[PDB]
């Protein structure tokens, strides 16, 4: 299998990397592991203007006031258990958001702050019949209401919730109150069931408290039951949020209709659906095991056909110290990170099931040393029924001596591993910034990108509407609209000239500059920077972009095209020559 | 004779060089390993970095000063300080064209430690360092002509007081040293190997303006200068007046809208790339004393070569073996040529100085050979940074990566060996040998980077190395804590809604690589605390109720559980 991509050759896979606490999404070529693009999401990007432009701030909403995010879990939308290449979704643990990225333009196009929760961590997508819901865990228990009356996590109204977002509308669909908390989550291959690990069944705030119980659990959600209660109006609402809220807590040992709690040791972490749809596999973390939940036994479990929730466990292989996450080659093998032993362990799932029945059989096939302390791992197409068994990325948290020293802060080590054969082969050490936690690969032919914008693209349609109100045809017009102390500049751009090369305003005016790149050649992006005003943005071919700033300094102020004589001048008349307020 | 260096750095092997890439319009500096071309680290400078909290923390905002209000930068030209014409590994400097700044990066901690807004100018673009006897000055071009004063009375760019200026910054103090008014616009700049001369390409035939830095220093020492506005910076007038020269400058006619301005590693030439002219112009540095002394009949007499090379020459670099390498933007090539043969051709000899043209993909701007800015230029690696990558990488939407192409120059024939895609047009880069960079493994508790925070802690009676304390001061709350995986030293505290909370964390772990983080959920608060570092961040607790904070940097098996609670009592 070819590991090295030479000049003129192209990568075989796209890789979509979480940006970690840096807040972006990164597009890599696989197997070269080179970074092809950065997609700003929760970060403010000087280069494109994301977080500065009106289009981007409109998408972020009120959360545009935050300059940070913390992402972990990128996932690609699916149709019938296969990637359809439409959307990528990712979490923000820092400011409790989910974002949607459109894979045709490689931009974030939608963002939501999840109501009545703190810290969106675990995230994964419904697989079947398609990605109708984005499933997202809120990790931290909080009071409801959280108004400063009650701080006690043991209060009956202190809890966290499982969250379902409508993937197409990026509005909330429902939330389910759970016992304990929520770590990671995955969905089955039918649409009925989703599942999440919990590490804080104790509802504690201290370290020893969260570690007390020998078993926490994975909570299983009957999504069909949830939907039926919503359609029946059997729900409540919290605060000013209209989101339907269902109670999936146990009441005095009696289960709700919406959830079952399968005891799993111990502070379990990863929650991974095998690519054949047979299992939710929970990684034991503090227990040296994974627990294999038989999805085929879940209907009987919710129908009371089983005596003990543990009856849905059909395997619990002992694997090594600190199992965190599991992935799949599509050949029947699972691959699990061992954080403490610092390895990836390859094991056969059907043999583990047989060992759980007492059959003496060695289900462990290989242990590969990684460098060092691996967290997530990802095999190519592992989240689909097309899991191809070719590439594996293990994302390790301490790179130590594997790269040149660069000061007290080290890179992460994302190691590419060839799993096409019976023996795992470490082929490449990939240093990355700010701790990507996890990544997702797609075949080259699963992603179809636009090379030039459509003039009706929803990304800037609000700006087109604003322009229409000013009587502006954006494809042609080079005009300065004045409106009190507001100035709206509209111009076309075509290399190497701005359509408006100078304009004059009064000191203190609020200036909006809207630029429509009317070029039609690929790769010829333009930029716009106003010197010493903190203004910067990208305008690609046929895109309209706009940015608003206060002309707070009198005098002449240059603007220039960043993304390459293509310059202009803003002239600001001093306040003392104009009416005084 | 052959170019046959190994390019593969396999698992467990280390790169041979550091590469320092400009972050382009994204505003950071990036550390790469060469020849693997992998990005080892991002150093935030003019960008706001969610990961480390640069732009959010009190330490970073103190370094940025008032310019902390800007969330953008536009970087181009990274350079490493020198002693006796060789890299000394102390500092890296870089420009900000967008908000007119220069930043200094300390190469032992790989952080920006100083930043200056250059007064009375717009857009710092070209930038290079004094070489000899060391980098006493950072030389920086302000690109755009503006009125002086720029107070809104005069907008006329032809006015006698409309001009731009060449800027000298004291590398060690990061304060302005002096500014020189010039005729025309400044493009790129470089310095000689004595400390006496610097040069910059100019567009108003245009010119290369040469600065006699010794003459400038003498005028400053004598008090023969003016100041502009409210800046104390000495300002000298390097313009021609009624055709008569300043003592500070000479204008050497050079075709045509010349762009790159590069000092050859043997110290013989300032080489200006011709752009609109399919040539480079070679200025003999050893004729400059005669030029300034009035012993030459014509400023053109310092030109000793003008080789014809191809369409669109933009920048030049050196292998230390006598060859120059120049980017041809239109022809989309690197052309390797012999400088002494070009000089003889200029005198009329029949000699072909062109050695090879290598196709690059596509439209190269800057290029950089390893150690090319030093008298130790080693002729091993070349990076050409091309603007239009077209079909050289997988498609990724309407925006495309820059193509930074690694070229083996160790032998007679240039060999293209790697295409490296990069984000936001890095534009230019610089390389250093592995052994020229020495980095700290853990922070020093006396480090100036957070010394102002240590001072604040001292005013509160706090021993940062041990204390876990909450200081109440009106509506201000100052939390001080130690951190040691997997526990914050203060795991809960209570404030009043509206309070201004400062959280100062000292990571007292001693193990390399065990960094800690701090994030306050739904408050826009995030920062890094590496081993032995103190970091602080200020935010207002504007929301009543229980608000979680957690460690963002995976540091331990129990990392998910390294958390705390801020309790905010309602108004
Ligand atoms: Cu957020 S956790 Cu194992 Cu996913 Cu990294
Ligand atoms: Cu300390 Cu994560
Ligand atoms: Ca527990
Ligand atoms: Cl998981
Ligand atoms: Cl140059
Ligand atoms: Cl040679
Ligand atoms: K790390
Ligand atoms: Na929204
Ligand atoms: Na400063
Ligand atoms: Zn440049
Ligand atoms: Zn250039």
Swiss-Prot record, chain B:
Binding-site residues, Cu cation Z4: 427
Record-stated family: Belongs to the NosZ family.
UniProt remark on cofactor binding: Binds 2 calcium ions per subunit. Binds 6 Cu cations. Each subunit contains 2 copper centers; Cu(A) (binuclear) and Cu(Z) (tetranuclear). Cu(Z) is thought to be the site of nitrous oxide reduction.
UniProtKB keywords: Calcium, Copper, Metal-binding, Oxidoreductase, Periplasm, Signal
NCBIfam families (UniProt xref): nitrous_NosZ_RR, TAT_signal_seq
Protein name: Nitrous-oxide reductase
Species in which this protein is naturally found: Stutzerimonas stutzeri
Enzyme class: oxidoreductase
PTM (free text): Predicted to be exported by the Tat system. The position of the signal peptide cleavage has not been experimentally proven.
Pathway where it operates: Nitrogen metabolism; nitrate reduction (denitrification); dinitrogen from nitrate: step 4/4
GO molecular function list: calcium ion binding; copper ion binding; cytochrome-c oxidase activity; nitrous-oxide reductase activity
